[PDB]
Swiss-Prot record, chain B:
This protein binds to 23S rRNA in the presence of protein L20. The keyword Chloroplast does not apply. HAMAP family: Ribosomal_bL21 (MF_01363). It comes from Thermus thermophilus (strain ATCC BAA-163 / DSM 7039 / HB27). Keywords: Ribonucleoprotein, Ribosomal protein, RNA-binding, rRNA-binding. Pfam families: Ribosomal_L21p. Coiled coil: none annotated. Belongs to the bacterial ribosomal protein bL21 family. Part of the 50S ribosomal subunit. Contacts protein L20. GO terms for cellular component: cytoplasm; ribonucleoprotein complex; ribosome. SUPFAM superfamilies: L21p-like. The keyword rRNA-binding applies. This is Large ribosomal subunit protein bL21. One of its GO terms (biological process) is translation.
From Swiss-Prot, chain C:
Binds directly to 23S ribosomal RNA and is necessary for the in vitro assembly process of the 50S ribosomal subunit. It is not involved in the protein synthesizing functions of that subunit. The lineage of its organism: Bacteria, Thermotogati, Deinococcota, Deinococci, Thermales. This is Large ribosomal subunit protein bL20. Coiled coil: none annotated. The keyword Ribosomal protein applies.
Curated annotation (Swiss-Prot), chain D:
One of its GO terms (biological process) is negative regulation of translation. This protein is one of the early assembly proteins of the 50S ribosomal subunit, although it is not seen to bind rRNA by itself. It is important during the early stages of 50S assembly. This is Large ribosomal subunit protein uL13. One of its GO terms (cellular component) is cytosolic large ribosomal subunit. It comes from the Bacteria. GO terms for molecular function: mRNA binding; structural constituent of ribosome. PROSITE patterns: RIBOSOMAL_L13. Belongs to the universal ribosomal protein uL13 family. InterPro entries: Ribosomal_uL13, Ribosomal_uL13_bac-type, Ribosomal_uL13_CS, Ribosomal_uL13_sf. The gene is rplM.
Curated annotation (Swiss-Prot), chain F:
The lineage of its organism: Bacteria, Thermotogati, Deinococcota, Deinococci, Thermales. InterPro entries: Ribosomal_uL22, Ribosomal_uL22_bac/chlpt-type, Ribosomal_uL22_bac/org-type, Ribosomal_uL22_CS, Ribosomal_uL22_sf. Part of the 50S ribosomal subunit. NCBIfam families: rplV_bact (TIGR01044). Belongs to the universal ribosomal protein uL22 family. The gene is rplV. This protein binds specifically to 23S rRNA; its binding is stimulated by other ribosomal proteins, e.g. L4, L17, and L20. It is important during the early stages of 50S assembly. It makes multiple contacts with different domains of the 23S rRNA in the assembled 50S subunit and ribosome. Keywords: Ribonucleoprotein, Ribosomal protein, RNA-binding, rRNA-binding. It comes from Thermus thermophilus (strain ATCC BAA-163 / DSM 7039 / HB27). This is Large ribosomal subunit protein uL22. GO terms for molecular function: rRNA binding; structural constituent of ribosome. It comes from the Bacteria. Gene3D superfamilies: Ribosomal protein L22/L17.
Length: 145, 101, 117, 138, 56, 109
RNA sequence: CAGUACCGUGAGGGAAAGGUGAAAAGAACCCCGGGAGGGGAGUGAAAUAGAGCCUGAAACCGUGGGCUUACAAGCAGUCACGGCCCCGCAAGGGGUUGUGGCGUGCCUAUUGAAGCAUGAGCCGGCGACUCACGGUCGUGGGCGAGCUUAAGCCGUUGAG
RNA sequence: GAGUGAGGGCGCGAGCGAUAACGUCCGCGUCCGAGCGCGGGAACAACCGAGACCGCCAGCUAAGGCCCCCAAGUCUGGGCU
RNA sequence: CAGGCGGUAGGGGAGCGUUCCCGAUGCCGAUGAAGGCCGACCCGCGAGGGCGGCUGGAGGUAAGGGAAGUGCGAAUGCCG
């Protein structure tokens, strides 16, 4: 931002061999490039997308997960409809659970999921499942062959 | 009447039932009874018989009573910017008790 | 990303205050001056934790000449007397028997030069 | 903690000197004994002392080769001139101050060397002006 | 002139112990109740030997 | 009990410093007399002060004239102001102005 | 309320300054009184909430308090013992010095320093090797004669 | 993956310089430097003796010490001064 | 148990505090968090960390690992 163009002499000056308004002191002037837009964007492929979710859930099965794959909860829309599928399925407040169903019906159904996930397409939210457990999938096909 | 001994380059003289410092050694806390070797004795009334040693056969006597205290120190030098700070020396302490010979 | 000082300087300059704040006036009112005087109250406090030993050492010894100057003889001399013959110690300090009842060490002084006949 | 400390020493008294005592040579001996050194009860912080007298303090065994051979070196010149006087004159002038010179020559230092000094009457009587204990020891 | 150094509140007050507060005297005057300083003129007792203030 | 004051001036506590270590000790009357006729600025100010404490001390706190000794005082600094003055090679001889903030107290004999 | 104060010949150069509370509800009244500034008292959870009003430290400023000083040689602190007023029933824990042994500081710079060879008015706060992409040699590692995909098309609150 | 060619002081050796210098230019050895943190040296990096963390109102001993200002015989002979 | 042990540069080992992440539709908190004056108890070898009182008046962040304008006596530095 084009600075005012230098200042006072040097040898003498107002006592201080220095005179470039680069502003090496003003709280908002000539500092250092810590940040910089590029927040370094690194990533990888399915080489691990698979292998990872495997050992985890597989171990989470050494604790018991569940898998249904495909079913009916009721009017695949209302909160407490699926509630009739919470106390009649078995699950309840503590272990925390996650589940994938690609039907937009379940989408505008699961709305706010206090205790669980609610998914649609193909993400990878092991994150919360790591600190949790219970699960269900959408066909052995969706997990990917 | 006094009495003296060394707990490893530390010479002390206790009346009947005193104590405060002397670093430390093992042997479980207050309830155990032990004793090492003496020099010649102590003064007052009528002592005065040291000679060659005497530290054989006989010996002194003292009880036990561990309280184990870590005692601070505070270390620091200072030369040309070399002021290596932050360093205490906990070390041991004993608050036991004594008796006779 | 936005990390800049704040209060941390005070922590690493406050000990400076307390651990000192009792010296002069200036060496106890400027973080640096105290800083430096801690270095002195340091090389000197450590130099006087180094001192006390090689100070009290002598204070006893000559007094031991004062036990023998009035009881007959002198220091160095009476020393050997014992050392060669039998037991060896009395610790240059324990001879504080000097103040607490005398005739005591009198008996033993004569014990020292005994090894000469 | 074998403290040892004398706790309230309380000084003594004495007398010394004769028309045949060796100036200086013996002075060293006063101080080492004036400090109360010979008193067991001792901690070089507790200023005690042996109240001293020194009668016959003139012509006192004039050492060896000192006559017209030893000079007095003190009193710094303020312009470019100082003070002097050697044996044959000073020795026989202000006799007290005369022997006290070889003494004042060395001495200790600090407020302690002072209080201690005070007790040191000198002249050539004998007989000291405040009779309080005279146990002379040669 | 022009020295290099700070200051010590030490000698500061040690040269002004002398400054001190020196009080201005107070003299007599019967009548009402005056106690007016050196040759003053006020209504407090007024005086009794002039022509300046009230004497009722 | 007997509460006076001294605040919002434009001059130095050192001018009054004397007007402190002189009044403390003697009673209400002793000082009132003295300082009143010990001119040199200070005097014509510490006056209205002995009166402000006087009005209320015997208004709300209930006390009396001759029983209210001069306990002691208090003397410290306060705010400033910016001003400048001409001088030298077009220089700038510059400063502020030191004001006063200090306390006074009496009590029950 | 700044591209405003201000400076500049011009060109232009260019500023500090956020904050009561939940609600001003913002002091009525009487006493000192020049208007000022004060005090009770009141609205008020709080006026050490009150108008250079949040909480408010540091350089600095003494009222009042305790330890201390006029025989005196001092990078000044230290430690030895000892003394005097504070808490701990106690054993001892303080403060601070009395004598005395101890006492050449520091940040640079450098065969070479304590340092009348530099700089440091003093405190607060702000202050300087990250990052991009690339290259190199190591590291936890997956797969492994195999081992990785650039920008895009769909999908993505968000993920892929 | 770093530092480094401003090193010198001392000693023997040695060219140099007027066996003139806390100098030069070296080989070497060593100490500092980097060991201004011991100790002697009166006080003082480079001389002799000494290589570093505790606590110590502990003991031997090397340099170097035994009248004072601070400590260990004003020892012992013998002579010389 | 032998061992080692000043150590400017330097190059190795750990750790220490300190601001934004997720754990935060988790948990302490007006029976005080942040700030701060005091401490002469508890641990760190230290880096620091705790804990308790008091002032103080709305937010903070476990274990954990994830980022790092930070680790500030000064530079006749910059500002007040």
């Amino acid at each position: 931002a084009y600075s005012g163009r230098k200042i006072w002499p040097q040898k003498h000056t107002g006592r201080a061999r220095h005179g470039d308004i680069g502003a090496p002191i003003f709280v908002g002037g000539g500092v250092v490039f810590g940040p910089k837009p590029r927040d370094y964007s690194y990533t990888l492929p399915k080489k691990v997308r698979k292998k990872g979710l495997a050992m985890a859930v597989a171990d989470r099965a050494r604790e018991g997960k569940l898998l249904l794959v495909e079913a009916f909860a009721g009017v695949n829309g209302k909160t407490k409809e699926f509630l009739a599928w919470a106390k009649e399925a078995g699950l309840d407040g503590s272990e925390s659970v996650l589940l994938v169903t690609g039907n937009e019906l379940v989408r505008r159904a699961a709305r706010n999921l206090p205790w669980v996930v609610t998914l649609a397409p193909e993400g990878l939210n092991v994150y919360d499942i790591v600190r949790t457990e219970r699960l269900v999938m959408d066909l052995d096909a969706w997990e990917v062959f | 009447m006094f009495a003296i001994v060394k707990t490893g380059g530390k010479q002390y003289r206790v009346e009947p039932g005193l104590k405060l410092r002397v670093e430390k050694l093992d042997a479980e806390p207050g309830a155990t009874v032990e004793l090492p070797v003496l020099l010649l004795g102590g003064e007052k009334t009528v002592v005065g018989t040291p000679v060659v040693e005497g530290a054989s056969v006989v010996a002194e006597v003292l009880g036990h009573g561990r309280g184990k205290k870590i005692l601070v120190s505070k270390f620091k030098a200072k030369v040309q910017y070399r002021r290596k700070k932050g360093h205490r020396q906990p070390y041991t302490e004993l608050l036991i008790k004594e008796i006779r010979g | 990303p936005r990390a800049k000082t704040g209060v941390v300087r005070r922590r690493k300059h406050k000990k400076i205050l307390k651990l000192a704040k009792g010296y002069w006036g200036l060496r106890s009112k400027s973080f640096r001056k105290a800083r430096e005087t801690l270095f002195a109250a340091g090389n000197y406090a450590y130099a006087h934790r180094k001192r006390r030993k090689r100070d009290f050492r002598r204070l006893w010894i000559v007094r031991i000449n004062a036990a023998c100057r009035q009881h007959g003889l002198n220091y160095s001399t009476f020393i050997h007397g014992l050392k060669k013959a039998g037991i060896e110690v009395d610790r240059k300090n324990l001879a504080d028997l000097a103040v607490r009842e005398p005739q005591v060490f009198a008996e033993l002084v004569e014990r020292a030069k005994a090894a000469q006949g | 903690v074998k403290t040892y400390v004398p706790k309230q020493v309380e000084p003594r008294w004495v007398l010394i000197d004769a028309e045949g005592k060796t100036l200086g040579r013996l002075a060293t001996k006063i101080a080492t004994l004036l400090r109360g050194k010979h008193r067991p009860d001792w901690t070089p912080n507790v200023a005690m002392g042996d109240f001293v007298v020194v009668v016959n303090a003139d012509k006192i065994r004039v050492t060896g080769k000192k006559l017209e051979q030893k000079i007095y070196t003190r009193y710094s010149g303020y312009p470019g001139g100082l003070k002097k006087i050697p044996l044959e004159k000073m020795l026989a002038t202000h006799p007290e101050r005369v022997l006290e010179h070889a003494v004042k020559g060395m001495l200790p230092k600090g407020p302690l060397g002072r209080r201690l000094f005070k007790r040191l009457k000198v002249y050539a009587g004998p007989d000291h002006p405040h009779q309080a204990q005279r146990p002379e020891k040669l | 002139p022009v020295p290099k150094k700070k200051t010590s509140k030490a000698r500061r007050d040690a040269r002004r112990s002398h400054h001190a507060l020196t009080p201005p005297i107070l003299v007599p005057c019967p009548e009402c109740k005056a106690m007016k300083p050196p040759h003053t003129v006020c209504p407090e007792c007024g005086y009794y030997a002039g022509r300046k203030v009230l004497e009722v | 009990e007997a509460k006076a004051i001294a605040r919002y001036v434009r001059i130095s506590p050192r001018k009054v410093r004397l007007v402190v270590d002189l009044i403390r000790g003697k009673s209400l009357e002793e000082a009132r007399n003295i300082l009143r006729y010990t001119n040199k600025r200070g005097a014509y100010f510490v006056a209205k002060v002995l009166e402000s404490a006087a009005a209320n001390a015997v208004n709300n706190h209930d006390m009396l004239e001759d029983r209210l000794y001069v306990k002691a005082a208090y003397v410290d600094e306060g705010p400033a102001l910016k001003r400048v003055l001409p001088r030298a090679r077009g220089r700038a001889d510059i400063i502020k102005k030191r004001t006063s903030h200090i306390t006074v107290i009496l009590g029950e004999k």
